[PDB]
Structures are given as C-alpha cells and as structure tokens.
Amino acid sequence: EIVLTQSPGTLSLSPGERATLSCRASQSVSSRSVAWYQQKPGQAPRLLIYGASNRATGIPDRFSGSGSGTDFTLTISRLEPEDFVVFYCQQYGSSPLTFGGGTKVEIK
Amino acid sequence: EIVLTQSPGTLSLSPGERATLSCRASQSVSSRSVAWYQQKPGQAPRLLIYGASNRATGIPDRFSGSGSGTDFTLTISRLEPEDFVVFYCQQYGSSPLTFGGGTKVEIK
Amino acid sequence: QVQLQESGPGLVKPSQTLPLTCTVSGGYISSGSHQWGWIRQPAGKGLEWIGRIYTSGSTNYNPSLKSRVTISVDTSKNQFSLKLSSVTAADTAVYYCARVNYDLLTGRANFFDPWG
Amino acid sequence: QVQLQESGPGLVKPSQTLPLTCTVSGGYISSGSHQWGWIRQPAGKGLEWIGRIYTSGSTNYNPSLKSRVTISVDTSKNQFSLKLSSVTAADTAVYYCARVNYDLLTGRANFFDPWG
Amino acid sequence: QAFWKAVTAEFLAMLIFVLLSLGSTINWGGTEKPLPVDMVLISLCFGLSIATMVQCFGHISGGHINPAVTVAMVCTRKISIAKSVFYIAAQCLGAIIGAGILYLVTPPSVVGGLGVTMVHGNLTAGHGLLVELIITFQLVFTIFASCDSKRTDVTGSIALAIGFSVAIGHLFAINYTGASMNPARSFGPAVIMGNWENHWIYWVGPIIGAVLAGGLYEYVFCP
Amino acid sequence: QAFWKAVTAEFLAMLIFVLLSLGSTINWGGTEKPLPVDMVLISLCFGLSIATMVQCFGHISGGHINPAVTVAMVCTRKISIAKSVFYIAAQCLGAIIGAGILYLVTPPSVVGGLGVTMVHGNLTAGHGLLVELIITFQLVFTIFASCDSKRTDVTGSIALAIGFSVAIGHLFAINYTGASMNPARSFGPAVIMGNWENHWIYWVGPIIGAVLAGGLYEYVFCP
Amino acid sequence: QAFWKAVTAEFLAMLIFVLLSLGSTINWGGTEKPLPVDMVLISLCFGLSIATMVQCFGHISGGHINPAVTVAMVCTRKISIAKSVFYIAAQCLGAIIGAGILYLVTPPSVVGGLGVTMVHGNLTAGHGLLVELIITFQLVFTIFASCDSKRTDVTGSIALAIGFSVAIGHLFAINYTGASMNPARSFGPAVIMGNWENHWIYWVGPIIGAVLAGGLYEYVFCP
Amino acid sequence: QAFWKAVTAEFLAMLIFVLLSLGSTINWGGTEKPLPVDMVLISLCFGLSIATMVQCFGHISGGHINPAVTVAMVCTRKISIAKSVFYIAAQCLGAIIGAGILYLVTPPSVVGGLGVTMVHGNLTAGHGLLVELIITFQLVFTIFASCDSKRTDVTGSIALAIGFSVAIGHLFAINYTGASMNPARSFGPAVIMGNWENHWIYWVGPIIGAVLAGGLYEYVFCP
C-alpha cells in the first residue's frame, strides 16, 4: 500500500496570503491519481480536487492543485476566514485506497 | 550529435525587466526534447524546464519556456536579484546527450 | 441532487455487531455509474476506508478489516447497510456513507464525492 | 526526498584512475523508474556528460569517453561508482552524480534532476 | 521411453506458450502514462501461440497444453489416470518456469501485473465463473470435433482451427475475467507475483466447461 | 433421432456466436468518455466466430447459423420445408438467449446498445437495404461455391473461407448499417433492448440477397 | 456458352472487390477532424476480398480480377488474345460500376477521395513507378507458383495464399503510391471522381512487373 | 544447373522479404511528431512476407530465407557444407540490396533508423541474447516439425504455419531486442546505415537457438 505523508503538520498564516500544502507518496502514483478533501471541524468532509489537477463543480477558483510522480501540491491563491481548517489527501492509483494524515491551517 | 548554441554569450538588464534566452539546435530535435538548467556559481545545477514547455515542481511561475523544431526560448517575466546566474540548455531528442554553452546574466 | 443519510444505534457494548444503514435520495443505486461505501473517522485522527459495494452485489473491503466488515445492498428500498462484528473500544468513530466513483475499465474505487 | 552525496580522493597524480562513489538516500535504486549517471564541469567551462547505469547493470557512456569510463552499481549498499582511467591534467573538474530520467519505450537517458 | 518424451514436450510447449503470450501483455508505457491496450495484439499472440505448439508437438505429446483439456480426455477415456497426472504437473511447472523467465528479462518499470488474470471489479464471482465456463466449453468442443477420427469432412489445418478458437475467447472476455481458458496459464504468474485473488474460479470454471464439452460431444452428439 | 440433434446444434451454435460476437462490441469507456472503436477487433471476432462453429457443428446440422442461408437452401431444394421451419425458430431463440446472457454478466455502465444494428443517420433506408443486400450476396455465394460437391479444385479449410467472407462484410458496412448479414443476429438484441427501428431491412435485405446468390449459382453458373 | 459465363464472373467479381475494398478506405471523421488511418483495416479488407473472389469464381473464370494478371497469362500462352480482350474490358467496367455504387450510398460529407490512389507528395513519379513494379512482381509470382500443375508440394488454400500476398503489398506501399497493384482498381475511382494525376504509372508499373514475374517463372525457374 | 537456380532464389526471396518487411516499419509521422507504433502491422507484414516467399520459392531452393535456418540444416546433414556457404552469401547480399532500395525510395524526412534492430536501453546484452535465442528456437522447431516426412498428421499450409511462427516472435520481442530472429535481416540495414551496436547478439543468439532446435528434434524427439 502507498503511504501518504502530509507536511507541515500545522500551517500558520495571516488571512489573504498564499497557502501551499504538500502530500508526498511513498511510491509512484499511477495516472496522477490523487484527490484532496476539505473537512470543517464537526462536519462531513468535502471534495476539492480529483486527479491532482481537476476542480470539482462549485469549488471556488482560488483552489488549484498540480503535480506528478510522487510530489503533489494544493495551492490557495488567497486565504479566506473559512479556509483555516483541516485538509486531507487521498491516493487511488493502486489498491487499497489510502488517506493522508491531515494538515490543519490556523490563523497566525 | 546535435550541437547546441546559446546566445548572447552574456545578457545584461536591470532588475525587473524581461529576460529571454535562445538555444538554437544544429539539427531537428524530436518531440520537443529540450530542458533548461540554472546553476548558481559554486553550486550544483538545477532543473527548470523539461520538454521545452513543462515546469518542474516548485519552480517559480516567472519561468516559462517554449519553442520547437530547432529553436527554443526561455523567458522570465520579471527578474529577481537571484536570477542573475548561468543558464544551460540540454537536448535529448537524439543520443548522445549534449549541453549548451551557457548564457550568463549580469546586472546592467 | 443526490443525498445520503445514515442510521444506526449509536451505542454498542463490546463484542456485538454494528448495524448501520444509509438511505439514498435524489438518485437510484441501480441506474448509475457509482459505487457506495463506508468511511469512518475516530476521534482526533484521520479518515479510514472500510469497504464498498456495487448494484450487482460485488464488494471490496479494507485488507485490515476484511475479516469483520460485511456490506449489503437493497436496491428495492434504495439502501445499503454495514455490519461490523467483534466491536471494541478502538472502534469508536463517526461513520460516513459516501458515493464512490470508479473507473469503467477495471471497476476500482476512485474518490468519494458526495458524503453523508 | 531523494538525496545524493559524492565521495572521492580529490587529488590524483597523472596516469592513475579516478574512483568516485555516490550514495543515495531517501530513495531506492532498484525500485524506481530512474537511471543514475555522472556529470562534470571543468573550471571555467560548461557541463559535460559522462555516463549512466541501470539497476539491471546496463550502462551507456559518452562516445568521447567510452574507452576510459567505467560505471558500476551496488544495489545492496544503494551506491553507484565511477572509474576513470589514464587521468590527465585536462580532467580537472567538478564531478556531479545525478538521477537520470529516461523513457520507458526505448530506455534512453532524459534530463538530469535532481543533482548531487 | 515414449512416455518421458510426451511429458517433456508438455513441459516445453507450455513454457514457450506462457513466455511469448504473457510478454505481449506488457504495457510499455509504464505505470506513469499507460499506453492504450491493444486487444487484437493480445488475442492474436495467445491464439497463434497455441496453433504453433499444436503444430510443433501435436504428434509427440498430443498437444494438450491445458490442464482443462487433459481432464476432459481422462473422463472420455482417451488417456489413463496415471498418464494425466504427469501432464498436469508438467504443464504447471512449465507455466511457472515460463513466467519466471519473463520476469527476469522484463525491466522493473514495466513488469506491472505480469499478465495475472483478474476478475472485473463490478463483476461478481458468480458471473466470472460463468464467463470462464462458456469460453472454455467452445474451446474443448473444437478440439474434439477437429480431432474426431470418424469425420471425413474436416479440411484445412487442425492446429490453426484450435488457435482461432482461443483468439475469439480472448476477443470477448479480456475485460471480464482476463480470458484464462487455461488453469495452468493463470497458475504460473500467480506463483511468481503471489497474487491469489479469485484464483479458484480459474480451476472450477475451465474444468467444468471442458468436461461438459467432452461428455456432450462424445456421448450425445457423436457417440 | 438425427433431426433433434441438428436442431439442437443450430440453437447451441447460434447461442455461442451471438454471445462472443456481441461481447466484442461493448464499449468499455462508458457513456462518459467512450473509447475509440476498434474496427478490426469487431470484424475478426465476428468472422472467426463463424469459422469456429462451422468447424464444430458443420457435420451435425449443416452449419447454417443464419436464417438467410437457411432460406437459400430451401429455395434450391437442399432442405425440406419442415426441416427449415425448425432451424429458423431454433436460430431465433438462440440469439435471444445469447444476448440475454451477455446482458446479465455485463455491468450496467457499459451495456450501451447491446450491439443492436442501426442504419446511419444520413443514410436512407433505401440505401441501407441495398448495402445489406450486397454483403449477403457474397456471403451466400461463398457458401455455395465452397461446399459444391462437383468441384475438384477446392483447397484449404471451408470453414475458414466462410469466416473471411463474414469479416470483409464487417470491415465495410459497420458504419453504414451495422453489417448484420444475418436476420437472427439482429433479432436477438432487439428483443432484449426493445429497439425496433428500421428492423425490417435486416430481414428483407439479407433474405433477398441470399436467394439471388443461391439461385444464380445453382441455376446459372454451375447447374 | 462457357465463354460468356467466364466474362460475367470477371465483371461480377471485380464489382464486389471494388465496392467492399474501397469502402474500407473511407475516412469517417470527415474533412474537419480526420480520424487516424488504420492500415491493418485496409490491408486485410483488400487481401481477404481477393481471397474471397478467387474462391467463389476461381473455377468459373480463372480468378484473375486483375488486368495485369490477364496480360501475364497471355504472354505465357495460357489464354488467347481474343479471350483476354473481354476480360480486361469486363474488369474495367466492373471497377467503374463498383465505384459508382460506393459513391451513391456514401454521404457527401465523407466521400473524400473515393479511394483513388495517389503518389506521395515527396516521391517522384520515377520512384512511384519502381514501387508499383515490385509489389506486383511478387503477386504474380505467387499466382504462378500456387497454380503450377507440375508441383506436388503445394498445401493449404491457394485462394488464401494469393490474398495474403495482396495484404503484404498494402502493408508496405499505402503511403508510397496507394498500393494499387491493379490497373483496373485505379481506373474505376478515377473515372467517377475525375482524378487523373500520375495515372500512367498504375498501368506501366503493374503490367511490367507482371510480365517479368510470369516470364521469369515460366521460362527460367520452372520451364 | 539446378544449383544456380537455388542460389538465385535465395537472393531474390531475401530481397523482397527485406524491402516489404522493413518498409512497414517506417514511421510516417516524421521526427517532429512521431505516430504511435502499430505492433500488429509490423508483426503481420513480417510473418506474411515469410509465408509468401516460402510458397513462392519453397520448391526451388528449400525456402530458407534465414542464415540461422541454413546452419541448422547443415548440422543435421540436410544440405552440404559447400551448398550452404552460397545460401549464406546470397542471403546477406539480398538483404543489403533490399535495404538499399528502401533507402532510395523513402523520403529523407521519414527514413529514421531504416528498421535496424536495437536492444532496449534498460536491457542488458546478456538478456537480449537470451530473448533472441528463444524466439528463434521455436521458429526452427516449427520448420522441422512441419517439414518432417515421417509425419502423416500434418494438415493445412506449411508455408502459413511458418509465417505465424515468425509473427508471434515479433508480437513478443519488438520492444526487447527488435525481434530479429534472422542474422541477415539485421545485417542488411546495418551495412547501409552504419549502425553496428550489439550486432554480435544477432548472430550468436539466433544461430545457437537454431542448432538446438534442429539437433533436439532430429536426435531426441523424432530420431
């Protein structure tokens, strides 16, 4: 199974600046098969990116992801008050499915 | 072997201007197979562009390259204090691998 | 739009089974290109997959849970259920039912949108 | 991430051999889709390719250096070595060990990221 | 001894069939950017490999090159129980050896699954068992009909007729169950790569279909 | 009774032909992003499936496997009127069962049209009828020519000659009218899926062409 | 009259070959977004169409279906001058009619070139003539060798042997000169669409290659 | 003199085989945007080209068209040493001339490698030698089995059986070592284009496998 590692464990920033998150895979992920999930504390998660580059319907344009091989990034152009929350990365290029650890974002 | 020539030998500009570098190939390069490297004096080189149009992970968005056939260009939208270093162009469309000559950038 | 709603006891003593049911509205399990699976999230940790099911009755489970999990589909009522056996205090979590995407060629489970 | 570190004498009299070793950390030579090769850069000049090697033991050398260059792989210790013979004052340079990309269909060497 | 030459031909015929046939299934685009699968290439290589080993070894060993075909022969009393124990062992060893050689010469970047047969994710094991039973029923019926000595209307190559029967089974069920049609063809790669999922349908499926075809032809249609 | 054996082979031959042949037409890219159609894959599977059942059942039932071919034999006085009613009925049921089994094992996401033949949108029903008439004329002419007992120059496999006749008809008219050439092959999927548009040209077309080929060969060229 | 039956078979054989073979060359993606060309599709349809008409009409007319093959037979004294004038006229008429029918049933959006052979833009007519002379030399040598009555080692289907000879010529020279190999196959579509560019190399080339193969076999190798 | 006709057939058979076979390997997308490689196109052209020259020249020279096959026949005492020196010389000259003609008619933009066989970059010369040794073992075993005069069970076309053996070797090892299977097929383009890398494995490999297959069949299996 591919083990996904997310760093930094916590990310601190002021509102409005740019945030970048990293999900590194222990093995090659086929066909850029990674998706990102966004969970409000005390709420069901949400889907942002699938395939590491495609944006889900109704997602704000400030969310964008990219990468290939074993290095994937999620970047937010401008933070918002409601974006200081947990984020998860999943890989589905080789079974079984696996999730990340979580990268909390907090207001500096 | 394909012989790569890079001109000008030295390129001078003030900070903030647009810098464009030319790597002309003595023979057709298959499948747009050219890559660019940036070496800080006294440090190992670095990979910027591969395939003449794709950007490596973590490279600033001000670096972009394009071209095809026997002429490829590297263009920088806005210069920075640390962008005045040597630049190399590589071709790998036909063996053996070959490098460029190098195009130093200096502060005018 | 498609919506999902869970249903279960909410308090199980150790060593029993955990029955959960997810009811789908706004979409039909049979007529569609999606699978249906379960995920959980124990307090203060990350999401963990459990398993899936297709309208045909074929299932896939987490290797670390394949012995205990059991998933069934009831297309007549537009529902699918979960049965986790030999529950232990380590099984405390919040259980979600989602709509699993998959690839047509191989039938493997892709990302998990939407959720319950 | 993958990292590379060179190792060698640093001062060789003319007509001996030049042994250099590159030790890889953060990645495995065998399990991967990359080759491993050497580059140099004589003082006040540009980069020059030397050769590569694969986990299977197949190598490719610069035509102008094919006679003197010799590259070997030690997957057990996660290392690959260089052996340049008949060294001369013109061989003074800074030697790098990189991770060579390649194309699956033909097995030829693509760009050289990362470097040592 | 004429027996040890027949057992040796079964081992060698199965070795070459597995190496060349499974080699055509390699995806040379790698795990990064897989190339589109060419179904005609895979179907023809499997079909033409069987037509070739039947031509080469048909007069030496009988040209079974299939554990399901050998079991059908025993039930209809065409080989003895003792003779058929050695063919199945020889066929299984040849599949193991043939797949091992492929793994040695194939670069680690493109080995992938090494041609291991797998059932489609959305297809139940009940459906996969039925698919294997039908593509194998028509294969063993072709063998019995082509090799029937009472017939006087058989024309053309018997080996080539059997090969095109293996091809059509592949043109149908590659995306359903992998189109094994051969218990030893699936046993080989599974041993090497250690992938053992739904492996019982590649023995129960093909064997049941082979026995139905042999019994139905020998005892109902052309007794 | 040899009569009930011939009727059973026609049902069993047609069941396998439709299942394997229609399975090759399934688009595994789904309705979201369909994959490019492999024209060679469909042509070879249809052609090689006919070559295989003619080999298997040719000596048991005559190897018609086609309601158009059965009618041609009746007109030329090669089978009785009673014997031909049961072949046509047996072929029609076999096609339905073969398409029904394909529907059960196929995931709902990729079933699509289930291989029902349809005329091109820009092509008139008058043009579609003409196309079906010509590809079937050359199919039945090959059957009559290959199986002519007065000939002394026929070489090779007769079953494979007929299969290559089916393949070339498919390599031409898949994008025109679906390349039916067979009234029962189109009747099968239509019943299951309930798609009945322009279905009369797949009976009149093939049947008209079959009668010309049988009558013209039997009474004009080689009487 | 056995003569008028032979002439009618040559007309009918050439009509079916041209219609089905040229139909396989239609680009169904239109002129807006052309689809990639499938060379295996075109080669097999041409080759298997030749194998089919030789099987059907081989015993009625001799199975020439080629003005270049007819010219070779006359020079080697296998048919009379009077007999061969009517075959060549019939073959050219069949190609015109076959290409005319293809034009009527094909939508105007996809007609394109109607299968007309053209020399590659970067090839001189001198190289095009040489290419046509070689792929035709090996075709007529195969016909003479397969049909040689002194041989006792010819096995399998003669019609299918000739068909695979046409296929390999197409697998080579489709992108060089269109792989005509047949003066009448090029005459048909040209008359309909009125494309007459470099049309003389498809008569001089194929005819020269046929006479060399016929004379070289008949008078040097196996006299 | 029957000897000079057999030597001339070996030169002429090898010339046509190399020209048509290597021509199908030309990439018509150019060096700018290469087109995807069609493995079925290359495999069928090589296989069907051998099936055709065996049919054409099988009764004149024996239809070797392979220096590795010629060496096997000498070892098993089927041709004389002096007789086999001229076949090897004729085969090499034919390949040189066949590739020379291909270079002249091909536009310089698409010539590329001219079909020169190369070993995969990630594959060692040790593995490349082993791959060439196995695909050639099964080719020469088919030749001996098909042409064995003691057999009474050989059916169909011998030439086409040998052709399908060449095709399956190509369907497997085009991406490993180029699937040479023939020392003279690799010698031709190398002389023209001057590519001599790892050229010793295309002589030792095929020849070693040919001698084992000939010796193993003639002296162990069917003595």
Side-chain angles (χ1 to χ4, degrees), chain C:
Chain C
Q1 288 70 240
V2 184
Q3 184 178 2
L4 301 93
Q5 187 65 61
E6 293 83 3
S7 296
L11 188 153
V12 183
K13 296 183 290 294
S15 82
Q16 309 159 261
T17 55
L18 182 63
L20 301 180
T21 299
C22 186
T23 301
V24 187
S25 296
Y28 285 135
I29 278 174
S30 44
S31 80
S33 66
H34 308 287
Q35 290 148 334
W36 313 83
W38 294 81
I39 311 98
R40 71 180 183 183
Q41 184 178 2
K45 293 187 286 185
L47 311 162
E48 167 193 17
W49 192 48
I50 284 178
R52 74 158 168 82
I53 182 149
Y54 198 58
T55 190
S56 66
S58 66
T59 53
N60 211 23
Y61 302 140
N62 210 7
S64 69
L65 294 174
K66 186 180 289 293
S67 62
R68 306 192 300 149
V69 306
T70 294
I71 298 170
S72 65
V73 73
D74 192 329
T75 313
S76 85
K77 296 184 289 294
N78 221 45
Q79 294 179 357
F80 55 103
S81 296
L82 176 83
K83 293 182 183 293
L84 201 78
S85 64
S86 175
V87 296
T88 301
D91 291 298
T92 288
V94 182
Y95 289 73
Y96 305 104
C97 61
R99 191 179 66 164
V100 186
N101 278 72
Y102 68 85
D103 48 316
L104 277 296
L105 213 47
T106 66
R108 310 251 75 73
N110 282 1
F111 49 88
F112 286 7
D113 170 71
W115 299 58

Side-chain angles (χ1 to χ4, degrees), chain E residues 21-46:
Chain E
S21 298
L22 290 192
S24 84
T25 61
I26 293 301
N27 198 311
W28 274 108
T31 187
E32 63 185 342
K33 294 181 176 67
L35 297 176
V37 194
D38 194 332
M39 308 288 303
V40 175
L41 188 135
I42 299 168
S43 303
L44 284 181
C45 188
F46 272 92

Side-chain angles (χ1 to χ4, degrees), chain F residues 122-221:
Chain F
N122 290 317
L123 184 63
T124 294
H127 297 136
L129 183 63
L130 179 59
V131 167
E132 283 295 331
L133 185 154
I134 301 194
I135 60 181
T136 312
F137 172 91
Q138 61 85 29
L139 171 60
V140 177
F141 207 99
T142 313
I143 294 168
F144 273 74
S146 298
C147 299
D148 181 20
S149 66
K150 297 183 290 294
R151 289 185 70 173
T152 48
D153 57 295
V154 169
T155 61
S157 171
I158 295 170
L160 188 80
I162 307 194
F164 289 162
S165 184
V166 169
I168 67 178
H170 275 79
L171 287 160
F172 169 45
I174 295 170
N175 289 318
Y176 288 80
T177 63
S180 178
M181 305 171 75
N182 189 358
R185 168 262 173 276
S186 295
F187 192 75
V191 166
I192 301 299
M193 290 297 261
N195 189 358
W196 286 113
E197 183 178 1
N198 297 131
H199 192 81
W200 65 271
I201 64 170
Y202 297 114
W203 288 85
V204 174
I207 284 170
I208 292 276
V211 170
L212 294 175
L216 183 63
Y217 187 89
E218 182 65 26
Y219 293 136
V220 178
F221 279 117

Side-chain angles (χ1 to χ4, degrees), chain D residues 41-86:
Chain D
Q41 182 176 39
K45 291 174 70 175
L47 311 162
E48 183 178 1
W49 192 48
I50 284 178
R52 74 158 168 82
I53 182 149
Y54 198 58
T55 190
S56 66
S58 66
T59 53
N60 211 23
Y61 302 140
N62 210 7
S64 69
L65 294 174
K66 184 178 184 293
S67 62
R68 306 192 300 149
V69 165
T70 294
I71 298 170
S72 65
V73 73
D74 188 334
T75 313
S76 85
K77 296 184 289 294
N78 221 45
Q79 294 179 357
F80 55 103
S81 296
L82 176 83
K83 299 291 180 68
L84 201 78
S85 64
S86 175

